[PDB]
RNA sequence: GCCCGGAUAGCUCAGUCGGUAGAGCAGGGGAUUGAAAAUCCCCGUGUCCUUGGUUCGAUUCCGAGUCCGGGCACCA
RNA sequence: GGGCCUGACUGCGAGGCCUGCAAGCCGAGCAGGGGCGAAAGCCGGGCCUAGUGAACCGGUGGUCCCGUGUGGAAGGGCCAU
RNA sequence: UGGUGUUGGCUCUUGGUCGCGCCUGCGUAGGAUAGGUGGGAGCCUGUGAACCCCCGCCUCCGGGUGGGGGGGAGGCGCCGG
RNA sequence: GGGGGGAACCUGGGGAACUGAAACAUCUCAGUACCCAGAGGAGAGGAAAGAGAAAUCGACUCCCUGAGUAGCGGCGAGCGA
């Protein structure tokens, strides 16, 4: 019911064994048997209610050591924000007619940011939004320093936003990052949530912290280590 | 409440063990019967180096349970009492059967150790467990007659 | 007074302090009264919403 | 029901305080007392029969002090109590207190 | 005072574990007709009580509130 | 009867009437900020005389006054009710 | 009279708790049943295939579901939609 | 060694009502009357797990003061550190 490239990864995992941020990071790359640079994913379980519409852990963190992944900023900006967005990492400018460049059918980016002056980006919106890509300053994607934003957008900056099932989701990098490189990758999301804890909650803020990869097996890892 | 099991118990464990049972069970059942001990630090201290001795006397229970097992497996005890064609006018108990092995057969067993959930009121042969040592069940044929 | 003519306060719509107490016949006036009353707190006339006394 | 034979808990004199009304903490106007009358709180004494030196000894002891007596029992094992009668045995175990 | 039930069409109610506001009703926007009947119909229509959020959209799901119907409790 | 409006005001109050007290009643005028009016002016509920009940206890909101070693808080005070 | 101590043991069954192991999720669209939230262009089977049969579940009747046997290297996938 | 007695005087266990509240139940009378036990010429208390705001004191007992004060109170009567 599984794959020999994956079951052999389940061969090397212990279901109930406790793992640390360093020890499991040894395990994230060694079981990285997918036929490309996998994604090292720290799938944690947050101890808060999303139905309680104040325990929304929606934010980002520019993870150290980057992410090894691809971020393409479809930058929205005008009036001296066009060209300062075109530089510092972004490549999709622009800068407000590109909303009309959204057919849609033009999804060659990985993120979209726009300065606070727009404005004309929220309405047009309806399809730029449903794929979780509408530029929202809640997590990075809006600011007058739209070029500065995209500067750390390209620097492996993950977003986090809890879901209906009390879960938060941002992998720490690719399967090309060693356990010591991921060790800053790993903790940079845990302690990123340690400060974003929406106060008012019963029990631990972190139920569990699991680490799987792109097609890879899960990993029972111990947080705060 | 913690206690040091002086015996292997089916619902508790084995001798030397310290389990937690409600005060009624050990405190009215186990301690007075010597089945276990309270878990005092003094008894914890003396606990070590005695479990060798404790399992020594326990092994003695195994041994005499064995030489007594094989000795009392091959015999049927008869109970001369006064009973009817389909009814015993008296009754038999564990201590009764022990009296029968003692005064009639001479063998000495423990009456309480014998299993008797119903004092017999009918004639004939009967097979029952004795179990002097834990996990040492002994059937036995006792014959009740008039 | 009556169960049909109830008491009531008049919160200021802005300072949010009940500055006045009056009554109405809720039969006749099923709507929350609202009247420009001098808010001493706000220190100026201001619409006051009828608040349940 | 007399004293606890170990702790010495005697019955106490307490008050039956019959109150009414809602408490102030619950927004109530205040617990108006409807009447007070004396009563006695009794210790929850029990019988404690123990085999010491082939003797059975009964202790009307407080329940909270039930296990305590067993301590004395074990503490009695450094004692020479035979063949004393239950009077002397009981007085001795009390002496262990 | 607390806890319970409801608020949806001009009415009663349905009402996805959110993708659909609908069953009838009142009619009528129409067409017949000098008027009016049987009639034709799509149905007309509605914040799914209001306030904010979940959402790739929330009558629903969530917090707050309003009113109403009910019980329980106090009553200086 | 119509127009507009909410003075069915805030802080007060010279003075008085009535009166054992307590209560009760009238109120110029002043200031804040308004209503109507051209303004003069009036508007501190109702043509008036009944439509009501001291204090205590407590609730609700404001207050930010006190907050028991300190800071908070509990809890109170004061205002409105 | 209910809780509780005194006051225990076995078991039969029921209501919670947590483990786990699983299945479960369906406008249209979208092949099909799409539970979200993250990575995903890759996956799988000689740590035996698309295929066929048998078995049960769900079943929204389109189907999925898990298990066996012949089969057992043949299926899909972001991209297509 | 104890027993029992000792005017009042002391604890320790128990512990009223009349009366005041101009009724009366909370309350006050009052932990009083009285009963019982125990002592002793005294008893008790007595060497801080105290006081309580000063980084202040320093076992206990009793006098004056604090003070009718803080407070408690059908916030009444009263009680009252
Ligand atoms: Zn105001």
UniProtKB/Swiss-Prot annotation, chain A:
Kindly indicate whether the keyword rRNA-binding belongs to this entry.
Answer: yes
Q: Is Flavoprotein among this UniProt entry's keywords?
A: no
**Listed InterPro entries:** Ribosom_uL1_bac-type, Ribosomal_uL1, Ribosomal_uL1-like, Ribosomal_uL1/biogenesis, Ribosomal_uL1_3-a/b-sand, Ribosomal_uL1_CS
SUPFAM superfamilies registered for this protein in UniProt: Ribosomal protein L1 (SSF56808)
Q: A single Gene Ontology molecular function, please?
A: tRNA binding
* CDD domains documented for this protein: Ribosomal_L1
Keywords in UniProt for this one? Answer: Repressor, Ribonucleoprotein, Ribosomal protein, RNA-binding, rRNA-binding, Translation regulation, tRNA-binding
Q: Which GO terms describe its cellular component?
A: large ribosomal subunit
Q: Which family does it belong to?
A: Belongs to the universal ribosomal protein uL1 family.
As for what it does, the entry says:
Directly binds to 23S rRNA. Forms what is known as the L1 stalk, which protrudes beyond the 70S ribosome surface. The stalk is preferentially stabilized in 70S versus 50S crystals. Interacts with the E site tRNA, blocking the exit path. This blockage implies that this section of the ribosome must be able to move to release the deacetylated tRNA.
Quaternary assembly: Part of the 50S ribosomal subunit.
Q: Which NCBIfam families match?
A: rplA_bact
HAMAP family given for it? Ribosomal_uL1_B (MF_01318_B)
Q: What is this protein called?
A: Large ribosomal subunit protein uL1
Specify the species.
Answer: Thermus thermophilus (strain ATCC 27634 / DSM 579 / HB8)
Q: What is the lineage of its organism?
A: Bacteria, Thermotogati, Deinococcota, Deinococci, Thermales
Swiss-Prot record, chain B:
InterPro entries assigned to the protein according to its UniProt record, in alphabetical order: Ribosomal_bL9, Ribosomal_bL9/RNase_H1_N, Ribosomal_bL9_bac/chp, Ribosomal_bL9_C, Ribosomal_bL9_C_sf, Ribosomal_bL9_N, Ribosomal_bL9_N_sf
**Keyword hit for Plastid:** no
PROSITE patterns hit by this protein:
RIBOSOMAL_L9
Q: What is this protein called?
A: Large ribosomal subunit protein bL9
Subunit note: Part of the 50S ribosomal subunit.
Gene Ontology BP annotations: translation
Q: Name one GO cellular component term.
A: ribonucleoprotein complex
Q: GO molecular-function annotation terms?
A: rRNA binding; structural constituent of ribosome
From the UniProt record, list the coiled-coil ranges. Answer: none
Q: What family does the database annotate?
A: Belongs to the bacterial ribosomal protein bL9 family.
Q: Does the keyword Nucleotidyltransferase apply?
A: no
- Reported function: Binds to the 23S rRNA. Extends more that 50 Angstroms beyond the surface of the 70S ribosome.
Keyword list, A-Z: Ribonucleoprotein, Ribosomal protein, RNA-binding, rRNA-binding
Q: Which domain of life is it from?
A: Bacteria
Q: Which gene encodes it?
A: rplI
From Swiss-Prot, chain C:
Q: Does the keyword RNA-binding apply?
A: yes
State the disulfide connectivity: none
SUPFAM superfamilies linked to this entry: Zn-binding ribosomal proteins (SSF57829)
- What's a GO biological-process term for it? translation
GO molecular function terms attached to this record: rRNA binding; structural constituent of ribosome; tRNA binding
Where does the sequence pass through the membrane? none
Cited InterPro entries: Ribosomal_bL33, Ribosomal_bL33_CS, Ribosomal_bL33_sf, Ribosomal_zn-bd
Q: Which UniProt keywords apply?
A: Ribonucleoprotein, Ribosomal protein, RNA-binding, rRNA-binding, tRNA-binding
| PROSITE patterns recorded | RIBOSOMAL_L33
Keyword Ribonucleoprotein on this protein?
A: yes
Its GO CC terms are: cytoplasm; ribonucleoprotein complex; ribosome
Q: Which family does it belong to?
A: Belongs to the bacterial ribosomal protein bL33 family.
Q: What does this protein do?
A: Found on the solvent side of the large subunit. Contacts the E site tRNA.
What is the protein's quaternary organization? Part of the 50S ribosomal subunit.
Record-given protein name: Large ribosomal subunit protein bL33
From Swiss-Prot, chain D:
UniProt keywords, alphabetically: Ribonucleoprotein, Ribosomal protein
Q: Where are the transmembrane segments?
A: none
Enumerate the GO terms in the molecular function aspect. structural constituent of ribosome
Q: Which Gene3D superfamilies match?
A: 2.20.150.30, 3.30.160.850
Q: In its keyword annotation, does this UniProt entry include S-adenosyl-L-methionine?
A: no
Q: Which InterPro entries match?
A: Bacterial_rp_bL28, Ribosomal_bL28, Ribosomal_bL28/bL31-like_sf, Ribosomal_bL28_bact-type
Q: Name one GO cellular component term.
A: ribosome
Q: Which Pfam families match?
A: Ribosomal_L28
Q: Which GO terms describe its biological process?
A: translation
Which superkingdom, per the lineage? Bacteria
**Ribonucleoprotein among the record's keywords?**
yes
Write out the similarity annotation: Belongs to the bacterial ribosomal protein bL28 family.
What does the subunit comment say? Part of the 50S ribosomal subunit.
What is the protein name stated in its UniProt record? Large ribosomal subunit protein bL28
Its source organism is: Thermus thermophilus (strain ATCC 27634 / DSM 579 / HB8)
- Lineage of the species this protein comes from: Bacteria, Thermotogati, Deinococcota, Deinococci, Thermales
């Amino acid at each position: 019911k599984h794959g020999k490239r994956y079951r052999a990864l389940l061969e090397k995992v212990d279901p109930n064994k406790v793992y640390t941020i360093d020890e499991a990071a040894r395990l994230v790359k060694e079981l990285a048997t997918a036929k490309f640079d996998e994604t090292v994913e720290v799938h944690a379980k947050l101890g808060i209610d999303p139905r309680r519409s104040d325990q929304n852990v929606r934010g980002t963190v520019s993870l150290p050591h980057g992410l090894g992944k691809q971020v393409r900023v479809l930058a929205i900006a005008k009036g001296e924000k066009i060209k300062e967005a075109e530089e510092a990492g972004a490549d999709y400018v622009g800068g407000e007619e590109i909303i009309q460049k959204i057919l849609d059918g033009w999804m060659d980016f990985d993120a979209v940011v726009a300065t606070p002056d727009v404005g004309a980006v929220g309405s047009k919106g309806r399809i730029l939004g449903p794929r979780g890509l509408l530029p929202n300053p809640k997590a990075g994607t809006v600011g007058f320093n739209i070029g500065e934003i995209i500067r750390e957008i390209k620097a492996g900056r993950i977003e986090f936003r809890n879901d209906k099932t009390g879960a938060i989701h941002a992998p720490v990098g690719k399967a090309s990052f060693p356990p010591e490189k991921l060790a800053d990758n790993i903790r940079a999301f845990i302690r990123a949530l340690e400060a974003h804890k929406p106060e008012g909650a019963k029990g631990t803020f972190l139920r569990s912290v699991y680490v799987t990869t792109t097609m890879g097996p899960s990993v029972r890892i111990n947080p705060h280590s | 409440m913690k206690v040091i099991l002086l015996e292997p118990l089916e619902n508790l464990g084995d001798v030397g063990q310290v389990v937690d049972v409600k005060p009624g069970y050990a405190r009215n059942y186990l301690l007075p019967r010597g089945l276990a001990v309270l878990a005092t630090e003094s008894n914890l201290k003396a606990l070590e180096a005695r479990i060798r001795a404790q399992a020594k006397r326990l092994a003695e229970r195994k041994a005499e349970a064995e030489r007594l097992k094989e000795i009392l497996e091959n015999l049927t005890l008869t109970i001369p009492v006064r009973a009817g064609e389909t009814k015993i006018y008296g009754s038999v108990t564990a201590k009764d059967i022990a009296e029968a092995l003692s005064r009639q057969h001479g063998v000495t067993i423990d009456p309480k150790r014998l299993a008797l959930e119903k004092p017999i009121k009918e004639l004939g042969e009967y097979v029952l467990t004795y179990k002097p040592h834990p996990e040492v069940p002994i059937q036995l044929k006792v014959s009740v007659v008039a | 007074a009556s169960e049909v003519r109830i008491k009531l306060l008049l919160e200021c719509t802005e300072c949010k302090r009940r500055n006045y107490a009056t009554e109405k016949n809720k039969r006749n006036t099923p709507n929350k009264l609202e009247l420009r009353k001098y808010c001493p707190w706000c220190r100026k006339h201001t619409v006051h919403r009828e608040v349940k006394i | 029901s007399k004293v606890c034979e170990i702790s010495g808990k005697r019955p106490i004199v307490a008050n039956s305080i019959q109150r009414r009304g809602k408490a102030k903490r619950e927004g109530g106007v205040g617990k108006k007392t409807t009447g007070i009358s004396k009563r006695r709180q009794y210790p929850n004494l029990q019988k404690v029969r123990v085999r010491v030196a082939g003797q059975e000894i009964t202790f009307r002891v407080a329940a909270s002090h039930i296990p305590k007596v067993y301590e004395l029992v074990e503490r009695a094992k450094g004692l020479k109590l035979e063949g004393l009668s239950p009077k002397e045995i009981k007085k001795e175990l009390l002496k262990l207190l």
